Amino acid sequence: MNTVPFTSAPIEVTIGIDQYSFNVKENQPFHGIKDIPIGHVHVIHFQHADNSSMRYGYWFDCRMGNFYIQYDPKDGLYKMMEERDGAKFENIVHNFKERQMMVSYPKIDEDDTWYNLTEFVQMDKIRKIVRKDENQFSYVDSSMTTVQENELSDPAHSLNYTVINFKSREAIRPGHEMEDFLDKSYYLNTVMLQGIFKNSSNYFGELQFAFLNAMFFGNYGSSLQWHAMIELICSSATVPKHMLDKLDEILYYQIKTLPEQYSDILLNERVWNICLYSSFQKNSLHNTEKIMENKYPELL
Amino acid sequence: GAMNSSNYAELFNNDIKLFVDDTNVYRVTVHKTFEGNVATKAINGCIFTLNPKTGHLFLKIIHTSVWAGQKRLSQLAKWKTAEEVSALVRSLPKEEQPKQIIVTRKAMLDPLEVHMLDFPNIAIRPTELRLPFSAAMSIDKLSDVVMKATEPQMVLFNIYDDWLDRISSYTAFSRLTLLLRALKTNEESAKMILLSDPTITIKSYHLWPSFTDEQWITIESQMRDLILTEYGRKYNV
Numbered sequence: 001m002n003t004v005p006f007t008s009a010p011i012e013v014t015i016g017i018d019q020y021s022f023n024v025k026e027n028q029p030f031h032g033i034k035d036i037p038i039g040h041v042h043v044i045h046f047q048h049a050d051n052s053s054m055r056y057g058y059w060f061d062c063r064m065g066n067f068y069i070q071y072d073p074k075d076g077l078y079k080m081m082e083e084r085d086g087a088k089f090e091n092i093v094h095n096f097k098e099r100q101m102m103v104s105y106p107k108i109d110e111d112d113t114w115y116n117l118t119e120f121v122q123m124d125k126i127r128k129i130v131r132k133d134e135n136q137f138s139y140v141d142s143s144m145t146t147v148q149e150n151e152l153s154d155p156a157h158s159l160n161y162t163v164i165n166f167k168s169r170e171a172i173r174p175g176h177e178m179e180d181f182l183d184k185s186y187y188l189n190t191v192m193l194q195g196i197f198k199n200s201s202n203y204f205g206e207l208q209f210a211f212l213n214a215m216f217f218g219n220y221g222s223s224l225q226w227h228a229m230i231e232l233i234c235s236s237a238t239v240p241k242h243m244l245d246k247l248d249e250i251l252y253y254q255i256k257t258l259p260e261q262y263s264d265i266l267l268n269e270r271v272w273n274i275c276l277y278s279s280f281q282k283n284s285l286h287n288t289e290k291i292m293e294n295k296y297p298e299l300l
Numbered sequence: 301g302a303m304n305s306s307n308y309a310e311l312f313n314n315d316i317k318l319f320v321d322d323t324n325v326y327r328v329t330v331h332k333t334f335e336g337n338v339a340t341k342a343i344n345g346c347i348f349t350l351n352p353k354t355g356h357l358f359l360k361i362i363h364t365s366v367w368a369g370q371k372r373l374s375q376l377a378k379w380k381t382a383e384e385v386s387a388l389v390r391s392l393p394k395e396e397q398p399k400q401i402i403v404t405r406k407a408m409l410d411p412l413e414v415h416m417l418d419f420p421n422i423a424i425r426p427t428e429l430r431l432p433f434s435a436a437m438s439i440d441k442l443s444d445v446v447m448k449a450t451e452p453q454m455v456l457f458n459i460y461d462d463w464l465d466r467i468s469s470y471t472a473f474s475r476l477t478l479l480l481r482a483l484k485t486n487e488e489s490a491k492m493i494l495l496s497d498p499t500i501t502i503k504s505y506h507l508w509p510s511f512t513d514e515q516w517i518t519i520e521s522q523m524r525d526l527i528l529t530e531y532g533r534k535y536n537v
């Protein structure tokens with residue numbers, strides 16, 4: 001179990017760690033988060049009490065280094081940093097633990113939610129969307145735009161998701177215009193799963209990463225990305241049985257975890273109704289459909 | 301975006317554009333089978349592609365053989381329309397390719413956008429006008445060539461005959477849509493109006509009779525009357 005210590009908490013902030021969150025008051029004696037499960041990526045995220053504008057955060061994997069949080073009063077945010085000095089860092093953590101100034105990552109032992117939301121999420125892969133290679137961790141916020149959004153302005157701060165566009169020459173083989181547009185199997189399988197993604201694990205990874213950025217940061221381009229990726233699979237007549245089955249699981253836990261109150265903005269009515277009721281795979285997402293119908297029958 | 305009464309004059313500027321109507325592409329007669337069920341028999345159709353400035357009509361004849369062995373024909377028709385329009389653009393010299401294509405039914409936007417991905421500089425647009433191009437099969441010479449076709453075939457017409465020698469494309473288009481609106485609302489009366497006077501003929505290379513300017517006004521008036529009329533008979537006003 002690993003630890004992200006905080007130098008201090010100078011400004012009142014709501015701190016999130018994966019799907020958990022807690023309030024820290026201005027200059028409360030708070031020195032970070034302990035017992036973080038190894039083996040998963042994690043995201044620590046922030047919403048300032050004074051400006052709920054800009055939720056922001058850091059994707060990290062504790063196996064990839066010792067990371068700490070330190071408020072920067074010039075840039076005005078909690079910054080993730082890497083401590084290269086291993087003994088400096090163990091020593092810092094042990095003192096804070098002894099003085100019990102750290103909250104415990106509060107995982108119930110029955111609980112596979114985080115695993116189920118991040119099964120295909122890998123930091124090394126994540127670092128090729130959020131390009132900032134001098135850091136082992138990755139910063140995202142609510143306002144970062146995607147590579148495709150900038151096509152339709154600063155490329156350094158972009159989310160380089162895979163660009164999916166259903167009315168593109170990439171998506172549409174000359175002479176199969178109608179076939180490929182009504183049945184996206186060639187785009188999903190040959191171009192996407194096979195030429196860029198290579199396997200379904202990688203495709204599922206970005207789909208998962210898009211959702212989480214949508215939910216935690218309300219990053220609108222991630223929501224479009226998450227949605228695009230679902231629609232391409234729902235609109236393909238030929239999808240490996242194991243992908244459909246895995247997709248149903250993935251979406252199920254995503255729908256389960258979404259805040260009830262944020263559903264109106266984070267869920268695209270057209271995409272879901274099409275995926276669950278009109279698409280080729282209208283019959284293949286039994287778990288996802290049951291939870292969608294029982295928790296958000298309004299959207300449908 | 302879309303095309304309506306506000307930007308109506310854009311049709312007659314010098315940016316090449318084409319209207320595409322797909323309403324006569326897939327045409328069927330519906331009949332009873334010996335077992336008392338219902339079946340459709342397809343008949344030949346046409347794509348109505350019209351340059352509203354010049355009057356050039358690219359009448360692509362859709363032979364019933366294109367449907368043989370196909371399912372979901374009403375949906376295929378939109379994609380076959382789109383394919384034939386994109387083939388037409390591609391056959392045209394660059395300086396003749398349209399800058400816009402305006403589809404008269406919104407269901408054509410996606411089929412055509414997809415078939416025209418190779419032409420990203422050609423804007424595909426809908427319209428909110430209720431244009432009467434479906435009545436193009438009430439023009440005898442157009443109907444005749446479509447029904448006689450034995451194979452796919454493109455036939456070029458000028459739907460304005462020689463009108464542009466005497467009037468403007470705005471005026472020519474308004475006459476055409478009034479003629480077609482009339483034919484759509486009451487074909488028999490509309491046609492009675494057009495031919496009542498045997499002395500006015502249709503030149504072999506024209507679609508419509510050779511009316512003087514003065515005769516056109518009488519004709520245009522009579523067609524307005526018919527349209528208002530049928531509107532009464534229809535609503536009892």
Ligand SMILES: COCCNC(=O)COc1ccc(F)cc1
Pocket residue numbers: 120121122123125126128129162196197201202203205206209
């Ligand atoms: C090079 O093309 C784009 C790379 N494709 C991928 O599938 C990598 O996506 C990710 C992204 C984030 C993850 F948490 C897992 C996987």
